[model samples]
Target: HHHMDDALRALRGRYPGCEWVVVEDGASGAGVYRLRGGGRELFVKVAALGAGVGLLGEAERLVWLAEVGIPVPRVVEGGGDERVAWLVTEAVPGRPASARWPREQRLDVAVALAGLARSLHALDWERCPFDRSLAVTVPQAARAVAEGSVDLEDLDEERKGWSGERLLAELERTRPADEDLAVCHGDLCPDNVLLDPRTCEVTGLIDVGRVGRADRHSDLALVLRELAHEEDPWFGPECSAAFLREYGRGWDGAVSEEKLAFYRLLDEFF
Candidate 1:
């Protein structure tokens, strides 16, 4: 509550002219405020103290991606400060990818997501300087597992009912399979993907603090998990296969299932 108070105070002080709308909860720890005035909308995301560094990292990534021609949010104002770190960006005019849509339109959105993933992966990793490396994330996951802070029950429902012993055993078995690293969005869940409902095209990628180098399977696995919940009948096998084939450049069964599973499970803890 103190953090929320501080955030609200900070926002009010910084933008006294604009009307502040109530913030709605999103996945990230950041507090979001919508500012409206002069027929324009701006989004202000206040980074939690613990995540201030990540916010700076995200700012750097956004600037880098924009320079390289990737579709990302344009940073209008931000910096890490003593009390709070904040980023203000031009709000993209679109809805979340998970928003309700016609079956055919959802399929098109899925295909667009697959294509965007491909484009992101195609960027030369050698040229990318930002380090959102898996080596950095693995230690965090290990610590979470060791401290029993990871909520295994909150993992994808398919694995929700496993006993602690079973969960640990599964982690042990899958840990060895982590390989084929590449730059990934880190968190590609539906909420982070912005889309144009009318055309079913991805407009921009957001919540990119976790963007970094990791196993390619890391991203593919999460997308597949989301696809499982999609109601479109054709979105299952056929669309998934097409996504993998186009994004992966070639189909490797081992990476898609085994390695992907490994990364997704690890992500649950981290």
Candidate 2:
């Protein structure tokens, strides 16, 4: 309650014409502001101190994707000082992929997500100015392991409690060769995906903060995790296999299950 009021106060001056709406759950660190004016709707996201980097990254990715004909939010306005920073973008009308539709619709949604991911990866890597390599992820993972933030116990219930050391060791063993890197949607879960109920098609990709050049498996692994949690258990495996078959060419099984396990643990902590 107090936090929401403070968030609204923070945005009142910048978005004078717009009213503040209830910030959604799971948005604990950042503030989401809804602006209404001149028959247009805008979404303003403000991040506290250290979160500015992610906000800036998202803004940059959205601009890049929009220019390349990918369906992403259009940047409206953005800037900030030391204390806080905000980026406003035109709101796309629709609900997150998880909230809308039934079990059957998820199949088409999965396919659309896979196709879009493939298309994004198909972009020429040399042309992309940003680098989202495993180099950055490795450090982040190391830090998480050191800080005891990563929950390795969640790896596999059937096995004994997995320690962070064991998880790190596994990742090392299965690390893929840096053969190909592509623009990746740092996070591709259902929460970040938007869909049109009428057409049952993926309308937009949100939360582009982590969008960068990295192993294609990073995105694929996350998508598989989300699919597994879907209503139909088999849906995840089928969608994942299909995605690999369609996009992966002589993939060499480069990304090992151990690496995928580490990534899955990271996702859980995140």
Candidate 3:
């Protein structure tokens, strides 16, 4: 548990004697925990220095995204030392959109997620300071592959057992010639979105370490990938269609399958 020992020290300084609970959810790779005491609840994320994760950048984006009307958690405190980086934020109320919904409710969930995507992508992409555009991320992918940081075991099904070099090679081969820019959530999977269970409305967006100006497909591809999973209960082509139908209302043209494939491939490096 020493991985989290620094996080506890950071948390106690701000909320001494509070109850801290490990949040065993999410694949964001942060050491996450929930703190409760004195009628206050907070969410904390910590990462070791040199872990190649962007904990501090995420905190900065949370503050900036709030100013731009995005439904993100309110950051309370953030700082780091030589060994670790940590951030604390006010808790957002709701279950993750990843929770299994009844068959009848899945359509509404899909629609709600579509609405969230439309609103988020509608933001002024040029004004966002962070960048996840191909120019930036392609180089990042190269670095990840060179540094041996890409997690081979967690790769997509089609990429299973592929070496980092192979993944990088495919990424370069398939890189899109142009980008449809938007303020992307970067990782838009259901687990990163919080929802009002009864109404299926988005409550907050979390795990935004990669949020930035990038191709809209960077977000769309990830959401669609999850929705199309055969093993996920209440998710399939029907829900994927509902999402696209709703999302299409805000879009002017058909989405490019080529771009989706390229972005999905690019994500393997992370």
Candidate 4:
């Protein structure tokens, strides 16, 4: 219960005189605060020690991505005590791709997202130290299921009310026999891909804890699913198709439909 207090104390001490404003745009399940002071802007993410791996992992990945010249938040400071972990990063100067745009701009945003994906996937997969390959992730999923950590209520629409065992069974049954290797974002929703509205260029990619060498479909499926949000006027099936078309340029093998579905299913365990 005192995690917030601890986080606030640490933040206040670290960023003296900076204003901390809660960012309420999305449900990241992390304490996200925006800091503004001295004509500079930054962001701080706070999480429990037990769940801090995601944030810490992101810190590592952000540094790696920055070194590779990929657009991502620059890690300013990151550390945690025994009870809580936190990260501070310079704010990327742009709006999230999830922001509502003019109808004409939506297609461009979709195209830009595809371009960002292309840049990431173009990286040398063999050199990456992190691993999100099925071999590693499948066992993690198994543990989540066995430990009753899967959130049943949060399962995707098609898998509503399904037990964790049921989810695991499907995950194994449809698991792809082979993986197409790429540097994946792990979670590539529009919300995480920021864009410069003025220049129409990708400014940064965030929420990258799951990023590593993995099947290209691991990222593609999630992007398609997110763009398929029917209720959201900014993007839908058309934008999804646009993303695919743009990303598929110069590709030899067609993107796998089966793997896409399998990966989406796999995402529920987290």
Leading candidate by lDDT: 4
TM-score, cand. 1 vs. native? 0.82
Per-residue lDDT tens digits for candidate 2, residues 65-154, read 888877887898666644456678887767666674566765676677677777888787777767777787766767777888776666
Model 3 regions more than 4 Å off: 1-4, 25-30, 51-53, 81-83, 230-234
The C-alpha lDDT values of all candidates are 0.70, 0.69, 0.84, 0.85
Local accuracy of candidate 4 as per-residue lDDT tens digits, 131-173: 9999989998999999998999988889899999999999998
- Candidate 3 lDDT: 0.84
TM-scores, each model vs. reference: 0.82, 0.78, 0.92, 0.93
Error of 2 at 140 (Å): 2.0
Ranking by lDDT: 4, 3, 1, 2
Give the alpha carbon lDDT tens digit for every residue of 53-143 in model 1. 6677778888888888778879887776544577777776687776766766666766777877777776777787765555676677666
Residue pairs with backbone overlap in model 4: none
Candidates sorted on TM-score, descending:
4, 3, 1, 2
TM match of model 2 to true structure: 0.78
Better structure of 3 and 4 per TM-score: 4
Worst 10 residues of 3 by lDDT: 24-33
The candidate scoring highest on TM-score is 4
Candidate 1 global lDDT? 0.70
lDDT of 2: 0.69
Segments in model 4 whose C-alpha atoms lie over 4 Å from true places: 24-30, 81-83
